Amino acid sequence: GEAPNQALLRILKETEFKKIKVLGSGAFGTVYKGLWIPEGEKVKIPVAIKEATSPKANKEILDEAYVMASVDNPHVCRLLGICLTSTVQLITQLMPFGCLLDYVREHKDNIGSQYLLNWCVQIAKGMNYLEDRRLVHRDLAARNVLVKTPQHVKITDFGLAKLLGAEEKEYHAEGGKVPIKWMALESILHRIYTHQSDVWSYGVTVWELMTFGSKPYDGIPASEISSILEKGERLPQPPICTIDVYMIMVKCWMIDADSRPKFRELIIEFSKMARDPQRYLVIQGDERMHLPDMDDVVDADEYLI
Amino acid sequence: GEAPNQALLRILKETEFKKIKVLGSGAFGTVYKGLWIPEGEKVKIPVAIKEATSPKANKEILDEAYVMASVDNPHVCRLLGICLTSTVQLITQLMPFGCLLDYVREHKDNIGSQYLLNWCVQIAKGMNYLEDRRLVHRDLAARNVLVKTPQHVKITDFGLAKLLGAEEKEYHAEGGKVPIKWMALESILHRIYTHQSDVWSYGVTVWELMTFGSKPYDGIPASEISSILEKGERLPQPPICTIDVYMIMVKCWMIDADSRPKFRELIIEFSKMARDPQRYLVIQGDERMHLPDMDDVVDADEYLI
């Protein structure tokens, strides 16, 4: 059949956390910034605690947990565990600088080509890793990438992720709210998802970064996209983008999914470019830009089982 | 490192074209004659639309696009843009009179020295320009030169073109179908390409024109050329060629690449000769030869970004 998923789902005690401050609130629920202090061992771990109780809700959050607990890569958010209190709580590694989309918007004037190209590589590594685990993200976007530090980002939000069977190359899903502006044509017309359709979204993510946080098809309404993409149109070339970099985005947008590049290739291409950043991204004043008890604090990346 | 290629790759909408008639068909795919009518602006642009879908194919056509979009000279075909429909489409400026090779064959009895010598100059200008852009064509031949008008030709077909790095004077390629009869010795023996090896091919192109479309080494099979060129032999002197003009071809065929003339020199030499055409080309009846809605039609050369 398929390989036995032997991941471990850790269940934590409510008394092992110290919600220090609220971070988010609205949509699904409320997110907290806090510390995880496992009993005994002198270690304090910065975490993001995501906490009403509706069978519809719980059902979904546990699924995210199934997925997060199954992944293990430096460029994918690590799940620390869950807490089964009145209302369920997902405990993940704290990503202090928030999501990339907000970060590029809030820091434009200080983000140079080295950072842009390196993020591209890191994300491609994360995605290539998810491909190995035969996992289709289905919602890759600048907003779903968190910032541990300006030098280290991680792919997150698996609330739509899917694990493809042994040899189930596609994924036929049903109705439901979907980020249309980030999806391949085949997903808008036949609600099909593949690793290659993830590449398309990767392409749009890269575009979001290059444009420093612009909005895909800013103006055009969701219902037209399908029409526009068929007409042969695609997102415009970002101002800082050399034809080399934009030439790669465009490819991620081929109609023929098998014509698009594979994450392992995007990794190679961007790695080369990242070796001479100023040759592929023209950013004004590029070279002159700079980007960034607790005695027993340890990053989640250093706390291992 | 190297200079940032800031060319713009324009992506056009399928609904902006009017394929008027087919032009070619076979080899790679099918070429169409048509009009490009950008939405709004009252302009109609005559274009050549080059349109199955195989990852091997698309990969190559996009590369041609990378190159064409990177060039900008009056003697090099201008890329108008591409269309990302089911199957990719390269949109270039329409060259009504076809390629030069066919043209000289079809018009012999009406092509005089003024035209011959002026084409030579124009091509040399195109090639000299590609040298500036540190670009090695690798497939210069009478068939790869299009005719916008009998007075204006342009270098085309960059399906083998290469962009040499900062100080990468040579280009070591691998196996693959190659126009052997048009290549320097060093390219047949060590698959090396340089601007100087482009000169060799230029020499053979000039020879093709002077002989009005003859076939290089007409008879001798590909496998012998290498042998023949080493023996000290070269293409014969064309009937209309004075020793002055043929003396220039021969030079382009030196074994010592650095002994061959440079495109900027071929430009000077032919320009001088073009000032008194009948002194360098003896063509019978030379002096008596003559060579050649749409209300908002504008040539691509007049439509600028």
Distance CA B178, CA B159 (A): 11
Distance from CA of B56 to the nearest CA of A (A): 8
Tell me whether residue A89 is annotated as binding. no
Tokens for A3, please give them: 């390989």
Q: Hey, what domains does chain B have and what are their CATH numbers?
A: 1-94 (3.30.200.20), 95-292 (1.10.510.10)
Cβ atoms of A216 and A182 within 8 Å: the answer is yes
Distance CA B127, CA B111 (A): 23
Alpha helices (H) along chain B: 55-70, 100-107, 113-132, 185-189, 195-210, 222-230, 243-252, 263-273, 277-280
Among B8, B10, B11, B13, which would you mutate to test the A interface (most chain A Cβ atoms within 10 Å of its Cβ)? B11
Residue of B32, B35, B28, B29 lying closest to B293 (CA atoms): B35
Q: Do B4 and A280 touch (CB under 8 A)?
A: yes
- Give chain B's radius of gyration (CA, Å): 20
Distance CA B153, CA B147 (A): 4
Distance CA B194, CA B206 (A): 19
Mapping DSSP to helix (H, G, I), strand (E, B) and coil, where does residue B148 land? strand
A25 touching B (Cβ < 8 Å): no
Nearest residue of B to residue A260, measured between CA atoms: B55
* Residues of chain B contacting A234 with CB distance shorter than 8 Å: 11, 84
Cβ atoms of B154 and B103 within 8 Å: the answer is no
Residue of A132, A260, A264 lying closest to A196 (CA atoms): A260
A280 touching B (Cβ < 8 Å): yes
Q: Do B88 and A254 touch (CB under 8 A)?
A: yes
- Spatial neighbors of B83 by CB under 8 A, at least 6 apart, are A232, B11, B12, B13, B14, B17, B89, B91
Residue of A169, A156, A236 lying closest to A203 (CA atoms): A236
A296 in active site: no
- The count of residues in chain A is 305
Cβ atoms of A101 and A208 within 8 Å: the answer is yes
CA distances (Å), A58 to each of A68, A82, A162, B12, in order? 15, 12, 18, 47
B305 touching A (Cβ < 8 Å): no
Q: Which of B9, B55, B87 sits opposite A243 (nearest CB)?
A: B9
Tell me whether residue A293 is annotated as binding. no
Distance CA B270, CA B98 (A): 24
| B289 secondary structure, DSSP code | -
Among B12, B63, B68, B84, which would you mutate to test the A interface (most chain A Cβ atoms within 10 Å of its Cβ)? B84
A9 touching B (Cβ < 8 Å): no
Alpha helices (H) along chain A: 55-70, 100-107, 113-132, 185-189, 195-210, 222-230, 243-252, 263-273, 277-280
Query: Rounded to an integer, what is the distance from CA A239 to the centroid of its chain?
Result: 24
Q: Give the count of Cβ contacts less than 8 A between chain A and B.
A: 74
Distance CA A149, CA B140 (A): 51
* Residues of chain B contacting A250 with CB distance shorter than 8 Å: 9, 11, 62, 84
Cβ atoms of A248 and A261 within 8 Å: the answer is yes
Distance from CA of B233 to the nearest CA of A (A): 43
Cβ atoms of A80 and A47 within 8 Å: the answer is yes
- The helix, strand and coil proportions of chain A, stated in percent and rounded to the nearest 5, come to 40, 15, 45
| B104 secondary structure, DSSP code | H
Cβ atoms of B12 and A232 within 8 Å: the answer is yes
* Residues of chain A contacting B5 with CB distance shorter than 8 Å: 242-244
Query: Rounded to an integer, what is the distance from CA B85 to the centroid of its chain?
Result: 28
